[PDB]
């Protein structure tokens, strides 16, 4: 049954709500983001309104097949009528098409939904800086203090460096990016660039990245591998076994892989600076897991909210347990009382 987190009160929305069936009452079904945890449900067969980004609306079209009648995509930073209901779509900083939704509801209430978001202090001069949010409903994947990590600029600058240098020393040296849904595009494309190659990949990701308005993409990607040096994986394949077997496919073109695994958070992150991370090695193929992220870091989490001083939150994430509940209102208490809301 649909999750009270899931439902915007004083209207018949749901958010990320596709694998409940048919949810009682529900006359707009909102996509936040295209991602399986949250899309999950949706097919050809889905016949109610989804409101959603332009990318996204790509999404459901050419890989989930989505007949366009039942598409409804709006642009961003526009106020827009819903059913009678004003509503906003936010830049989330997630992954493409990724964003927060802002609904007016008729009574005066104000409610902001973040979706999945990696907050940002540019967030402090959008639309959300005109007005007073009296709910939010937050992405808390990460709210506890002992997740830090770097900048996406640090993590970045590091990769570039670590493959040029490689690429440099050894000019039959193959680089290897695992990835397993939209999301973290950066990575694989930052690295092409250095090297003057294109990122070859199979023909059902290159269709994915097709959908996303990025600038100069058929500059970018290819699914010709031959020509290039950058290659692209899914993830499963990015471990010792995976890779010499790709290495075998290339037929001694390359005599070595340096792979990178974007992560989220791991444990080396308390410990470690990013200048210190240091690859897993196997004969001729390494290894390096840096932590780019897509979500807030607990005080990226903090800074937002102490900002925009809600009057009630309600968590998305990580809310299946009593300990986890119980500890996030005790931060949410925490940060309130530290800033005087
Ligand atoms: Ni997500």
Redesign the pocket.
């Known amino acids: 049954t649909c999750p009270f987190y899931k439902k915007i009160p004083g209207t018949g929305f749901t958010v990320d709500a596709f694998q409940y069936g048919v949810v009682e009452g529900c006359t707009a079904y909102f996509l936040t983001?295209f991602?399986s945890?949250?899309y999950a449900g949706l097919s050809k067969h889905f016949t109610f309104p989804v409101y959603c980004s332009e990318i996204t609306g790509n999404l459901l079209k050419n890989k989930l097949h989505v007949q366009e009648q039942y598409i409804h995509p709006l642009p961003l930073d526009t106020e827009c009528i819903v059913n009678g209901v004003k509503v906003v779509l936010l830049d989330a900083n997630?992954?493409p098409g990724?964003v927060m939704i802002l609904f007016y509801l008729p009574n005066g209430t104000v409610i902001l939904h973040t979706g999945?978001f990696r907050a940002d202090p540019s967030m402090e001069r959008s639309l959300l800086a005109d007005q007073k949010v009296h709910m939010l409903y937050l992405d808390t994947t990460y709210c506890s203090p002992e997740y830090t990590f770097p900048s996406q600029q640090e993590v970045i600058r590091f990769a570039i460096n670590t493959a040029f240098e490689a690429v440099t020393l050894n000019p039959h040296a193959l680089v290897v990016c695992g990835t397993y849904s939209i999301g973290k595009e950066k990575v694989f494309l930052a690295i092409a660039d250095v090297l003057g190659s294109k990122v070859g990949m199979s023909q059902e990701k290159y269709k994915t990245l097709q959908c996303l308005n990025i600038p100069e993409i058929n500059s970018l990607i290819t699914t010709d591998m031959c020509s290039s040096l950058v290659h692209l994986l899914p993830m499963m394949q990015i471990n010792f076994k995976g890779l010499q077997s790709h290495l075998k496919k290339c037929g001694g073109k390359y005599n070595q892989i340096l792979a990178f695994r974007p992560t989220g958070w791991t444990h080396s992150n308390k410990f470690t600076r990013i200048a210190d991370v240091i690859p897993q090695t196997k004969g001729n193929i390494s290894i390096y897991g840096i932590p780019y992220s897509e979500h807030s870091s607990y005080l990226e989490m903090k800074r937002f909210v102490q900002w925009l001083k809600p009057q009630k939150i309600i968590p998305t994430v990580n809310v299946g347990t009593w300990k986890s509940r119980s500890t996030m209102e005790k931060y949410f208490r925490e940060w309130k009382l530290e800033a005087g809301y």
Do not use: E, G, S
């Open positions: 983001h991602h945890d949250h997630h992954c990724a999945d």
